[PDB]
């Protein structure tokens, strides 16, 4: 048992004959891959088992045997020994990059090296060492790409290398790297779900710089490939749809007038939010993307959007971002489509999105963005349908938002949205003296605190205008 | 003037809205319905001269009792109340669960527990109606601020109990 392993590792330190050491390493690798016990993981974790092997492989590069089986041996050891990654750091990256550099031009030698690199990069804190080497790891992997395992491992790798290459590094990459992947694999492995996932999220990672959108939209290649992947590759895959959706969200800008493609992606977005409504995975990205694209497109679907937004609020009350994006989408939809004003409400067959929006506002007072979006949404809703007036008033909205603007005062946008919402809420109604005393001083103080901002002044003046006009004695006070 | 928030919690189908409609919308009895989500009501009380208080009643839906009772509802809240129907001991165990949950996930600026009141709903129904002797055990064991019988349809003691609870709340 362990006595034979001790003899093998002792003989491994001799480094006498390359062929004999190769056969011994092969025998040790064959014996180590078993489910009998953790004898190979005897907690020693001695580098003397594998450091001389990699030293021999690097120095004697012509020895293909040690290259072929030493990588498999270390892969098996890492997959078996739990603390092998802990033994890696606290180097080996330089050794593996030299292995990939000098003589890994063969398919068999390349695939094992890329697999070992992929499993090593799952540990963390070693990517910085990999990116600060001298072997040009990005150039190495670019030169590596044409076999399926190579590709599925070319990606699942790179995926982490794009985390901090540099916005500039991505910019250098956009010139030539896109072809070595998008052209190289999306077409080639059109039938490889994991490869498609890795390629799509690598596109996500490289899409961070703003200048590269024009490069990505050179011939609408990004939009077409992602739409085709969403349509065909993944009818019922959550990860693919989520990644493609995040690409959609990050690829919305002043060039949004991709009319036909607009319609296409809009449909795909609907499909996404209708087929996986259980996590932030799709909801936030799609709703924000959808809101902008719906504004552009509108210049049925609206009912589906209302339902999707209602479940978005319902199932993710704890996340500020989800609610913000969903209520913003509801606002932007209701702005361009007013026919559904009666289609929403407390009555049966209509989504009660009012109480949900109010609950969102109360439960996330600390964020100005959620207040801004939800306030604009329910203000537009109140302007659309007159029936909702005096119902929220009876529900406790006025003094509540007054206290909220009292809490949030350092920003002008929040004050402007609050004043606009008060204007559209209190229109066409008559209040009492108590409401006057509870409303006018607070809004006057808010207007004083933000005197320079023109929209805040306009909205405040409009609200005061619509709101200003025994009993005589009280009114005098 | 001041504003405050009160959270009404309890078991399912106990007529939570009935009480909140009776105290604010002046709607009592009526049809028995299921509360899908959290609903709101406003109350204005002229407790003292030049001192008018506003109350926001949040009637938490008890259908998803097994679901995690998020602290966001109790966040910034100033008062709470547990109301259970008197025709089921399961409602009594549920009220104990609500008490434990609020004691675990509610905080005050002074750190003391916020006032709580045990509402014995619709006592105007046979047979377990005036079993105050059994209720007194939990009344003194749980350390509740108050306990009071009530009937949503008849509104026999909603007003006095609410006045006592709000007076206790401003007493802190
Ligand atoms: N037996 C009896 N039933 C009453 C009395 N008063 C009201 N009810 C009935 O009880 C019903 C309770 O329905 P509802 O208020 O909608 O229940 P809810 O508790 O708000 N639903 P949820 O638990 O989700 O909040 C209605 O109030 C009425 O039909 C009463 O004095 N006796
Ligand atoms: Mg109810």
Author numbering:
A (entry chain E): 12 to 101, 113 to 167, 172 to 325, 344 to 513, 525 to 532
B (entry chain B): 5 to 176
What do the authors say?
Mutations in the LRRK2 gene, which encodes the leucine-rich repeat kinase 2 (LRRK2) protein, are among the most frequent genetic causes of late-onset PD and account for ~5% of familial and ~1% of sporadic cases. Most LRRK2-related PD mutations, such as G2019S (Gly2019→Ser), have increased kinase activity. Previous studies have suggested an emerging “Rab29–LRRK2–Rabs” cascade for LRRK2 signaling, in which GTP-bound Rab29 (Rab29•GTP) facilitates LRRK2 membrane recruitment and activation, then activated LRRK2 phosphorylates Rab GTPases, including Rab29 itself.
